[PDB]
Amino acid sequence: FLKVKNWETEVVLTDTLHLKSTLETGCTEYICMGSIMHPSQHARRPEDVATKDQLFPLAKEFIDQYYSSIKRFGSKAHMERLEEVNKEIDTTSTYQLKDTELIYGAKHAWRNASRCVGRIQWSKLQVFDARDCTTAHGMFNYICNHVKYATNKGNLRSAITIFPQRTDGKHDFRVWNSQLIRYAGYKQPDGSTLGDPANVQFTEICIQQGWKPPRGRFDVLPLLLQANGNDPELFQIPPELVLEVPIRHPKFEWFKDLGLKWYGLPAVSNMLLEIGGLEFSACPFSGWYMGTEIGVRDYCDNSRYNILEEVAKKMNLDMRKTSSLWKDQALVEINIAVLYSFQSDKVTIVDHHSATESFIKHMENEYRCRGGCPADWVWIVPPMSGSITPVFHQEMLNYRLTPSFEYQPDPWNTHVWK
Amino acid sequence: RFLKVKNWETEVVLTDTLHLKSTLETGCTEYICMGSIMHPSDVATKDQLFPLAKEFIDQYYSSIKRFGSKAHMERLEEVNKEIDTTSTYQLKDTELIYGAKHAWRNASRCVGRIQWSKLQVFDARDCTTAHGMFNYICNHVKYATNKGNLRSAITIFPQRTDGKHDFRVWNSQLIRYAGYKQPDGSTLGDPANVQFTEICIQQGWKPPRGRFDVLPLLLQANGNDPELFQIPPELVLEVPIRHPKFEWFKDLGLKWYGLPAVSNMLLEIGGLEFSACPFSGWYMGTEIGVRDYCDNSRYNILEEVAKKMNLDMRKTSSLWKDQALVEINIAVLYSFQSDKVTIVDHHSATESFIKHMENEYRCRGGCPADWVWIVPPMSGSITPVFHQEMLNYRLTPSFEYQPDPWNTHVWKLV
Numbered sequence: 001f002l003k004v005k006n007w008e009t010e011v012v013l014t015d016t017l018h019l020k021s022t023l024e025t026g027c028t029e030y031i032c033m034g035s036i037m038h039p040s041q042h043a044r045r046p047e048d049v050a051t052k053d054q055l056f057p058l059a060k061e062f063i064d065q066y067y068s069s070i071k072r073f074g075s076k077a078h079m080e081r082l083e084e085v086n087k088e089i090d091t092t093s094t095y096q097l098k099d100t101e102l103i104y105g106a107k108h109a110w111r112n113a114s115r116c117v118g119r120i121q122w123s124k125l126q127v128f129d130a131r132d133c134t135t136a137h138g139m140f141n142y143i144c145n146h147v148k149y150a151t152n153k154g155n156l157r158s159a160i161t162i163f164p165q166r167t168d169g170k171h172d173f174r175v176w177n178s179q180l181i182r183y184a185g186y187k188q189p190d191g192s193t194l195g196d197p198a199n200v201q202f203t204e205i206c207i208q209q210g211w212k213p214p215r216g217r218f219d220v221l222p223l224l225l226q227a228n229g230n231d232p233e234l235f236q237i238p239p240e241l242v243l244e245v246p247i248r249h250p251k252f253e254w255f256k257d258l259g260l261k262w263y264g265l266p267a268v269s270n271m272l273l274e275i276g277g278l279e280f281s282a283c284p285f286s287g288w289y290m291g292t293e294i295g296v297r298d299y300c301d302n303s304r305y306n307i308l309e310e311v312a313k314k315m316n317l318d319m320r321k322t323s324s325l326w327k328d329q330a331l332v333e334i335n336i337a338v339l340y341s342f343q344s345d346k347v348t349i350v351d352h353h354s355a356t357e358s359f360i361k362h363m364e365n366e367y368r369c370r371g372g373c374p375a376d377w378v379w380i381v382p383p384m385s386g387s388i389t390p391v392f393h394q395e396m397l398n399y400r401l402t403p404s405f406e407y408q409p410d411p412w413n414t415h416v417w418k
Numbered sequence: 419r420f421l422k423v424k425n426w427e428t429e430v431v432l433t434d435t436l437h438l439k440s441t442l443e444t445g446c447t448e449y450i451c452m453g454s455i456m457h458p459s460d461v462a463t464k465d466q467l468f469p470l471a472k473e474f475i476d477q478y479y480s481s482i483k484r485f486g487s488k489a490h491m492e493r494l495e496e497v498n499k500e501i502d503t504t505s506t507y508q509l510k511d512t513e514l515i516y517g518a519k520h521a522w523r524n525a526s527r528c529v530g531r532i533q534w535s536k537l538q539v540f541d542a543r544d545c546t547t548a549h550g551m552f553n554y555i556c557n558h559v560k561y562a563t564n565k566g567n568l569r570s571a572i573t574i575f576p577q578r579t580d581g582k583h584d585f586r587v588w589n590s591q592l593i594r595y596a597g598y599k600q601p602d603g604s605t606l607g608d609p610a611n612v613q614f615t616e617i618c619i620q621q622g623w624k625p626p627r628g629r630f631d632v633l634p635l636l637l638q639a640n641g642n643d644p645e646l647f648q649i650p651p652e653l654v655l656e657v658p659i660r661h662p663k664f665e666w667f668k669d670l671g672l673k674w675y676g677l678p679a680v681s682n683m684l685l686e687i688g689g690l691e692f693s694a695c696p697f698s699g700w701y702m703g704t705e706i707g708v709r710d711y712c713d714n715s716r717y718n719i720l721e722e723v724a725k726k727m728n729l730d731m732r733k734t735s736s737l738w739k740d741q742a743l744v745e746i747n748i749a750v751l752y753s754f755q756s757d758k759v760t761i762v763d764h765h766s767a768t769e770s771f772i773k774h775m776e777n778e779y780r781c782r783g784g785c786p787a788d789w790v791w792i793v794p795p796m797s798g799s800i801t802p803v804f805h806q807e808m809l810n811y812r813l814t815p816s817f818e819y820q821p822d823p824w825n826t827h828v829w830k831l832v
């Protein structure tokens with residue numbers, strides 16, 4: 001038993017789910033790594049094609065969990081499934097998931113994502129099975145359909161598209177983009193950066209692959225898609241599938257003249273989805289934005305669009321010294337405008353007040369039915385106004401449950417070109 | 419072994435070797451992280467005390483470039499003699515100063531540690547009565563306050579002996595405001611202090627029953643019942659809160675005290691436990707403007723400020739709370755600066771902490787830091803500490819939590 005307390009409400013929750021955790025957190029009895037971005041390299045199967053004694057135990061554990069979930073365990077179909085997975089590994093060194101197991105696995109990987117404040121939605125996830133894909137052209141078709149379904153004319157819907165699992169490690173499917181939709185970044189001759197500085201390296205790869213850059217501040221990047229280990233290929237997402245929101249402010253009429261915009265669909269495409277020892281290296285997933293992601297991090301991080309100085313000037317703030325809080329003051333106005341703009345255009349978005357409140361309710365739900373909820377305080381607390389949200393005052397336990405979403409190397413560090 | 423921490427804004431990478439010197443638990447295990455748990459959870463024997471004392475004396479003599487010296491070996495022998503004959507020992511004044519400074523240096527939740535080596539240590543180990551403690555604390559407040567040019571200080575009372583004769587300051591800080599629950603369920607003053615205010619009233623304090631009554635000192639010497647004392651009002655420096663642009667702000671009637679002075683923690687040096695050790699620095703603005711004023715369970719002023727600001731309070735997505743929070747914190751900094759009372763804003767403070775952290779990795783091999791506490795409670799990611807990976811571990815000497823004394827004290831009168 002482990003208790004967590006909320007210091008605002010004095011609610012105490014009791015955690016037993018942590019007894020099912022599989023991987024190391026990175027912490028020990030003597031050192032806490034809770035603010036390390038990648039604290040652990042502990043993996044459930046070695047790098048390349050596992051032996052039978054390595055894969056089968058992980059498969060059995062997942063199948064046991066799935067059949068437990070549906071009030072079976074030991075049933076006819078469970079034992080036959082075990083035997084089927086046994087023969088499949090014996091004869092191919094891997095196995096294939098049933099459609100139901102795949103959906104269960106994807107939803108539970110989201111459910112287990114301790115860094116995600118959005119998980120009250122976890123069981124309402126649309127799963128697109130793309131395991132029949134064979135070429136980068138087919139990957140583009142599956143991704144276009146995902147983007148169109150998920151955008152839904154602004155009434156955003158959570159979705160995941162799952163490409164063929166890893167086999168030997170030389171035939172990986174990868175989306176090289178970090179998100180399906182991001183803006184290019186360009187190193188300028190004088191030394192500054194145009195567009196998104198985070199994407200300068202990826203933009204250079206695209207240009208080096210023949211992309212013709214319009215060289216603006218908000219150029220939607222092409223897709224760079226890799227199927228079955230082959231060299232990646234460039235595709236332009238049809239712009240009518242890319243919903244964008246011009247940013248304006250409900251009081252500052254000059255705000256629109258800053259020429260800011262963002263895209264509506266946050267779609268992570270560089271993570272790995274691990275189910276029963278199987279590794280799905282291409283599994284783009286998408287939901288909808290919390291405003292602080294755009295307003296605080298994308299726009300105001302020093303190494304991103306870094307717009308605080310420009311907004312503060314227009315606001316006529318005292319920028320001589322930090323103690324005028326001119327940065328904090330512009331920061332609020334920017335986040336007001338982001339929310340106001342998405343809402344004006346009827347594009348789904350949630351503010352950090354509503355999102356964090358939903359997550360406290362999700363925590364309570366999970367402790368009641370599941371006996372726990374893994375949660376990473378460092379990621380869950382929003383990057384502005386921390387303590388006036390309820391999650392700031394909520395103790396959380398962090399542990400690693402499977403199925404899960406994991407980080408993986410960027411493909412340009414590992415891909416041997418042809 | 420080595421551990422690396424990266425800053426994701428600057429890509430600077432630092433290498434921690436100092437974590438190898440910890441030997442106290444964090445509360446985390448290899449499969450669970452408890453990094454957001456507030457408190458992750460009676461006197462040492464001779465055998466327990468020997469190695470704790472040795473480790474501390476060894477690190478003192480190493481710090482002063484005399485490890486292995488004749489003075490080092492004789493001090494070790496002398497300490498062992500005391501433990502053997504008295505079951506405890508006494509620190510030299512130099513060791514006490516060194517221990518107190520390093521407890522601060524090791525405080526993983528404190529963002530102000532760039533200042534750690536400039537700490538004025540008042541030795542109060544000869545004190546025997548609550549009247550004596552009051553005198554020592556008055557002198558601490560006056561020295562630390564310094565007419566608004568604040569100076570860090572700590573006053574250290576006699577160490578624990580058998581656990582039945584503890585010195586304790588029952589206040590959680592030296593200066594705080596009273597809280598009174600009303601019959602209708604409202605609270606007047608600071609709701610955090612309702613319980614301690616009740617104890618004071620029960621002990622004979624006559625409260626003014628206003629919004630900002632400075633509480634009396636409740637002081638316990640040698641395990642006796644605690645005794646009430648009024649800090650002389652001319653030693654309690656306060657700042658009335660006004661705003662540089664909203665002339666109505668002063669009409670909220672807000673004020674705060676200038677000296678933050680924690681008095682309920684325990685200072686452990688070489689196995690010795692100093693249960694009464696009040697220490698003081700100066701404020702970071704968000705402590706007052708964000709937590710004291712805008713926590714829902716504290717003075718909770720967001721509503722009244724936003725109303726006078728004429729904000730739309732119907733929807734959360736108007737971010738009226740966020741907008742009013744910023745203005746309150748502007749007022750707090752402007753007020754202190756105008757009255758020439760030392761204060762630091764969260765931007766300046768976090769920037770200095772990054773510089774201190776880098777220096778500590780260079781000269782010491784690391785810097786234990788609690789990201790959950792170091793990142794300020796507003797505007798988190800526009801400060802540099804948000805982007806800084808940190809390792810948290812427990813080094814000694816250290817400041818430790820201890821039970822509230824009213825939960826363990828057994829009373830003697832009537």
Ligand code: HEM
Pocket residue numbers: 110113115116117118119121125158159160285286287288289290293350355379405
């Ligand atoms: C439905 C609305 C959703 C909201 C509002 C939401 C909110 C968030 C936010 C604010 C973050 C932090 C992002 C960052 O700082 O980079 C995050 C992270 C994450 N989300 Fe969610 N999310 C949603 C849906 C989803 C879905 C559908 C999935 C997967 C099926 C998912 C899986 C994750 C994962 C794995 C992370 C961690 C990313 C990392 O470690 O880099 N989320 N989410």
Ligand code: HEM
Pocket residue numbers: 518522525527528529530531533537570571572697698699700701702705762767791817
């Ligand atoms: C000199 C200026 C100082 C500044 C600006 C400063 C800043 C801070 C802040 C903002 C906190 C967090 C407070 C909270 O959120 O409750 C803190 C905590 C702390 N400070 Fe410092 N501090 C200073 C001096 C000191 C000194 C002189 C000591 C001891 C000698 C000290 C030891 C601590 C400890 C032990 C904590 C953790 C308290 C807890 O866990 O409740 N600090 N400091």
Ligand SMILES: CNCc1cccc(-c2cc(C)cc(N)n2)c1
Pocket residue numbers: 118179266267268285286287288289290293
């Ligand atoms: C490496 N950062 C991960 C990352 C970066 C950018 C956006 C997200 C995100 C993802 C989803 C599904 C919903 C949401 N509101 N935001 C996640």
Ligand SMILES: CNCc1cccc(-c2cc(C)cc(N)n2)c1
Pocket residue numbers: 591678679680697698699700701702705
């Ligand atoms: C329960 N938190 C402890 C606490 C509560 C209130 C204030 C502080 C503090 C202490 C010092 C020395 C400097 C500073 N700026 N603030 C610490």
Ligand SMILES: C[C@H](O)[C@H](O)[C@H]1CNc2nc(N)[nH]c(=O)c2N1
Pocket residue numbers: 035036037378379380426804805806807808
């Ligand atoms: C060092 C620190 O862990 C890092 O900056 C983290 C802090 N918390 C975060 N929280 C979220 N949601 N997203 C992030 O990218 C980060 N970055």
Ligand SMILES: C[C@H](O)[C@H](O)[C@H]1CNc2nc(N)[nH]c(=O)c2N1
Pocket residue numbers: 007392393394395396453454455456790791792
């Ligand atoms: C639950 C959580 O650990 C708790 O609210 C912490 C968060 N970080 C904090 N950080 C500081 N400086 N002070 C605090 O009181 C807290 N409270």
Ligand SMILES: [Zn+2]
Pocket residue numbers: 027031032033034446450451452453
């Ligand atoms: Zn930890």
